[PDB]
Design an enzyme around this catalytic site. Structure first.
Site, PDB file in Angstrom:
ATOM      1  N   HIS B  21       0.828  -1.211   0.000  1.00 25.84           N
ATOM      2  CA  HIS B  21       0.000   0.000   0.000  1.00 25.84           C
ATOM      3  C   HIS B  21       0.864   1.264   0.000  1.00 25.84           C
ATOM      4  O   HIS B  21       1.697   1.456   0.884  1.00 25.84           O
ATOM      5  CB  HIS B  21      -0.972   0.007   1.188  1.00 25.84           C
ATOM      6  CG  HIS B  21      -1.729   1.292   1.339  1.00 25.84           C
ATOM      7  ND1 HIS B  21      -2.909   1.544   0.674  1.00 25.84           N
ATOM      8  CD2 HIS B  21      -1.459   2.409   2.057  1.00 25.84           C
ATOM      9  CE1 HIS B  21      -3.339   2.755   0.982  1.00 25.84           C
ATOM     10  NE2 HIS B  21      -2.476   3.301   1.819  1.00 25.84           N
ATOM     11  N   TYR B  52       1.522   5.810  -5.733  1.00 26.47           N
ATOM     12  CA  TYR B  52       0.381   6.376  -5.010  1.00 26.47           C
ATOM     13  C   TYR B  52       0.782   7.219  -3.808  1.00 26.47           C
ATOM     14  O   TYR B  52      -0.075   7.780  -3.119  1.00 26.47           O
ATOM     15  CB  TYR B  52      -0.584   5.278  -4.575  1.00 26.47           C
ATOM     16  CG  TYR B  52      -1.361   4.676  -5.724  1.00 26.47           C
ATOM     17  CD1 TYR B  52      -2.361   5.402  -6.360  1.00 26.47           C
ATOM     18  CD2 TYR B  52      -1.095   3.391  -6.172  1.00 26.47           C
ATOM     19  CE1 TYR B  52      -3.078   4.862  -7.407  1.00 26.47           C
ATOM     20  CE2 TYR B  52      -1.812   2.842  -7.214  1.00 26.47           C
ATOM     21  CZ  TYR B  52      -2.800   3.583  -7.830  1.00 26.47           C
ATOM     22  OH  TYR B  52      -3.519   3.045  -8.872  1.00 26.47           O
ATOM     23  N   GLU B 135      -4.876  -5.440  -8.473  1.00 28.81           N
ATOM     24  CA  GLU B 135      -5.385  -4.531  -7.455  1.00 28.81           C
ATOM     25  C   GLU B 135      -6.254  -5.318  -6.486  1.00 28.81           C
ATOM     26  O   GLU B 135      -7.138  -6.066  -6.909  1.00 28.81           O
ATOM     27  CB  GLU B 135      -6.206  -3.432  -8.118  1.00 28.81           C
ATOM     28  CG  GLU B 135      -6.871  -2.481  -7.182  1.00 28.81           C
ATOM     29  CD  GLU B 135      -7.573  -1.360  -7.932  1.00 28.81           C
ATOM     30  OE1 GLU B 135      -8.734  -1.555  -8.367  1.00 28.81           O
ATOM     31  OE2 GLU B 135      -6.957  -0.288  -8.101  1.00 28.81           O
TER      32      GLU B 135
HETATM   33  N1  LIG Z   1      -2.473   3.420  -2.235  1.00 30.97           N
HETATM   34  C1  LIG Z   1      -2.293   2.184  -2.964  1.00 30.97           C
HETATM   35  O1  LIG Z   1      -1.221   1.599  -2.894  1.00 30.97           O
HETATM   36  C2  LIG Z   1      -3.218   1.785  -4.027  1.00 30.97           C
HETATM   37  C3  LIG Z   1      -3.083   0.487  -4.626  1.00 30.97           C
HETATM   38  C4  LIG Z   1      -3.963   0.166  -5.649  1.00 30.97           C
HETATM   39  C5  LIG Z   1      -4.888   1.080  -6.036  1.00 30.97           C
HETATM   40  N2  LIG Z   1      -4.979   2.302  -5.440  1.00 30.97           N
HETATM   41  C6  LIG Z   1      -4.148   2.640  -4.451  1.00 30.97           C
END
Ligand SMILES: NC(=O)c1cccnc1
Ligand SMILES: NC(=O)c1cccnc1
Lengths: 501, 501
Positions: B21, B52, B135
């Site tokens: 994450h 992210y 995902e």
């Molecule tokens: N914050 C994340 O890692 C993440 C992973 C997959 C989709 N959206 C966010």
């Protein structure tokens, strides 16, 4: 077992179809169908395209079209594949014996005929076509009565004019009188060749093998000089603004023709057409650009052809091997190419950015991923997703964002499912309403596409209301993908959608 | 039912199931104390999670937080979905069509029905088009059992810009652009200082209008400045690698330089995010990045610093000549970020033009395999297959002269009767002959042109008389021949295929 589309299959009394026939078989074939496969089609204009002399397929004489009719009952069996092995296999057919020889036997006609006297197989005629192709078993085909739809030869017309004027009836539409054009072209070529100013420019010609960059320069001068003739005045106006229609392109065209036509070629229309047909730049003479046929009256077409002809005459001593081609086989052949391309533009076709046809602009290529993506379904509550492919030809070009149509409740942008994936890197977007009929989504990481770097823009719409989006309600019928910035504006890449259901 | 939304084959029960994450700055320490709150998202790919971790307020150029590895204790069910549509999923899975999906997924009932003895269910979806990552979608309550570990904190690395994030991602590929941006930054500033002192350069500057002037005059000056500048010892290598490719010439550097001055006002200059936004939508960046024809040519720290050092100097000179300090500050900072973005794209696995359904763009044409399956030539069986290739062109009518098809004695032959090309639905049969070197050349029997609004579908039919598997053909491509243009050649449009099974 399904290689067979029930819903497109049926039985019919007096089933008729069309068969295009080559010169030398028109009268002959009316005496009956003799050899398995004998092909016919539900479309007589597509039938026509098969009528051309096989010795001279590009420019030969066209024969005719006949209507063939089975008396009694005929089973038309529509297939989902054209793969004979799959077909032999999913129909418990003998996997050893041919397919067509099998559909002619009573055993097969019993099991799939539904009471008919024979089965005729049906296939989609071609991609981008809604016509149908029939495959007929030779034995069963002896039962057909044959009737004349049209003989193109009895027509007495030059070249393939009769075949093309016929096909052009499909759209009631570029429907030109090639006889009028031929005579007008002849007349203008003659008038041009006498003009004082033009005979003079001609005498200013080095009349000998010169460099390509030099011949072009002369020809641009000849063109400019020739375009002032009263007989080409309309052409002077219509070619005045579009860069594709400029003297430089006529010159490049003439030079190009001069370069490829030798004596052996000059002296044969088939060989001349083969050689002309592979050259670029023909759009400049045809007056075809931006998806439209601009030169669309007999007068303007004849002017453009006359000019081109005089120019090919000039370029020959300059870059040509030819020690009259310009006024004979060059005219006959180019007339044929006009007709081919006109026919294309007359046929129903999807424009760039519609369905899965790419939109091609400023170096970008974009397209709806599949047909369904290009459809925005309405009249229900809930979600839908739409995928657009994006790339560029060479260096990395940006995607600034995307303009999406919106209707409160009926079509909102789902801000959290809309994204753009760049070689698999998923890039979320920041969407803000503008007009209120339009939302602009910008990516939260820079997007570039190019050779080896592609993107999938995934548009997600959400519907809070079950009410259907009506005709006069959508502000636009396209989604606008914005490319680089170039008054400051963005390269506009349009994907056109349809509202359905 | 359930089978229509769940991919049974890609679903599993796993013990100590882990995923990654990406976390924003300021949360890298707090997230490690447990996951708390509509859905919690994770991925099987730690480099994708890295993307992210960028500051939401400054998406383009902000600071990167970090990555954590989250692990469920005991047994977890990964439920892979065929669709991402909430409604479809609630329906077919016989859920409450009124509650949010993920809320229901975390209940005992759902977990008993689909968990297979597991303590909870996680949903799985393809991460993105063009990606092989996955995902994971996690219920908030169930996410409470997750133990959280640090994988990497990009801030502890305490590097400049987004270097830590991008350098981490480049580890995916151990070919691979793996640059030390610390060195590029040092070398860059060092060269900007050196160039700016140089006698000949300082000279050339005072030779500048130093005031608002047209675009064509600033371009001339900058081209001159460029050439003078390029002879500095510290840009020696750059001098050689930009020697031959026209994308990299001084003209394009000046066009870039002038573009940057035109769009950067005082407001923008003062903010890195706003600068990156403005810069990101300009064309021509491939000229500075040294990126063309599907390759990153500037792939050494030395050569990148030289290119960047040159552009900065040039933007500095363009600002008084066509614009409104920034040149060595935010311009450098910002363009560094953009290099990193495009680099990351080229490091990611992707299909090159003419492979799978990626289009091949060349000489005005666009061609592509119609679907993935078309681009595969199955082997190890006797019989037929068909292969659809879309063909169009950007604007004026451009010809298709023919197609070159690879063959193998008795293992792969061209079916001459089924092979054809359809132009806006006109089915055009082909004349094919085997030529030297196990290639068959097929040319259309009526002239083919494509252009805006005229597209073709080339249908190649192969026949296999042997069941012998094809072992490791001469070519791995089909050559579609465009217009004819030393010697006479045709434009080559290549579609690349794979042999399978
Ligand atoms: N914050 C994340 O890692 C993440 C992973 C997959 C989709 N959206 C966010
Ligand atoms: N000779 C024909 O008219 C014909 C029709 C359909 C397919 N092939 C040939």
């Amino acid at each position: 077992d399904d290689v067979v589309d029930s819903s497109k299959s049926f039985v019919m009394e007096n089933f008729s179809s069309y068969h295009g026939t080559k010169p030398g078989y028109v009268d002959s074939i009316q005496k009956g169908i003799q050899k398995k496969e004998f092909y016919s089609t539900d479309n007589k204009y597509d039938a026509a395209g098969y009528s051309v002399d096989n010795e001279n397929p590009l420019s030969g004489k066209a024969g005719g079209v006949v209507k063939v009719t089975y008396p009694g009952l005929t089973k038309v069996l529509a297939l989902k594949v054209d793969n004979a092995e799959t077909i032999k296999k999913e129909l418990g057919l003998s996997l050893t014996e041919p397919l067509m020889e099998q559909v002619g036997t009573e055993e097969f006609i019993k099991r799939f005929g539904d009471g008919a006297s024979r089965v005729v197989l049906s296939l989609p005629f071609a991609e981008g076509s809604s016509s149908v192709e029939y495959i007929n078993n030779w034995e069963q085909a002896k039962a057909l009565s044959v009737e004349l739809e049209i003989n193109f030869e009895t027509r007495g017309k030059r070249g393939q004019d009769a075949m093309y004027e016929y096909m052009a009836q499909a759209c009631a539409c570029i429907n030109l009188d090639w006889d009028v054009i031929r005579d007008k072209t002849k007349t203008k070529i003659e008038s041009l060749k006498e003009h004082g100013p033009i005979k003079n420019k001609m005498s200013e010609s080095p009349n000998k093998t010169v460099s390509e960059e030099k011949a072009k320069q002369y020809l641009e001068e000849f063109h400019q000089t020739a375009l002032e003739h009263p007989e080409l005045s309309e052409l002077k106006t219509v070619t005045g603004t579009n860069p594709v229609f400029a003297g430089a392109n006529y010159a490049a065209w003439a030079v190009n023709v001069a370069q490829v036509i030798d004596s052996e070629t000059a002296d044969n229309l088939e060989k001349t057409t083969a050689a002309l047909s592979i050259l670029p730049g023909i759009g400049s003479v045809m007056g075809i650009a931006d998806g439209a046929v601009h030169h669309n009256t007999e007068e303007i077409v004849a002017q453009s052809i006359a000019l081109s002809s005089l120019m090919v005459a000039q370029a020959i001593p300059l870059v040509g091997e030819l020690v009259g081609f310009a006024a004979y086989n060059f005219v006959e052949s180019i007339i044929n190419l006009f007709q081919v391309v006109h026919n294309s533009y007359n046929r129903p076709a999807y424009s760039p950015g519609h369905k899965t046809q790419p939109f091609l602009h400023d170096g970008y290529a974009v397209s709806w991923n599949t047909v369904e993506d290009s459809i925005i379904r309405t009249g229900f509550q809930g979600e839908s997703g739409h995928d657009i492919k994006i790339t560029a030809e060479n260096t990395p070009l940006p995607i600034a964002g995307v303009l999406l149509p919106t209707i409160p409740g009926k079509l909102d942008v789902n801000k959290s499912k809309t994204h753009i994936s760049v070689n698999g890197r998923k890039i979320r977007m920041r969407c803000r309403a503008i007009d209120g009929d339009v939302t602009f989504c910008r990516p939260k990481s820079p997007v570039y596409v190019g050779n080896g770097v592609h993107a999938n823009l995934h548009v997600a719409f959400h519907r809070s209301s079950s009410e259907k989006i009506h005709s006069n309600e959508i502000s636009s019928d396209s989604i606008g993908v914005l490319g680089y910035q170039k008054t400051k504006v963005n390269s506009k890449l349009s994907l056109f959608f349809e509202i359905k259901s």
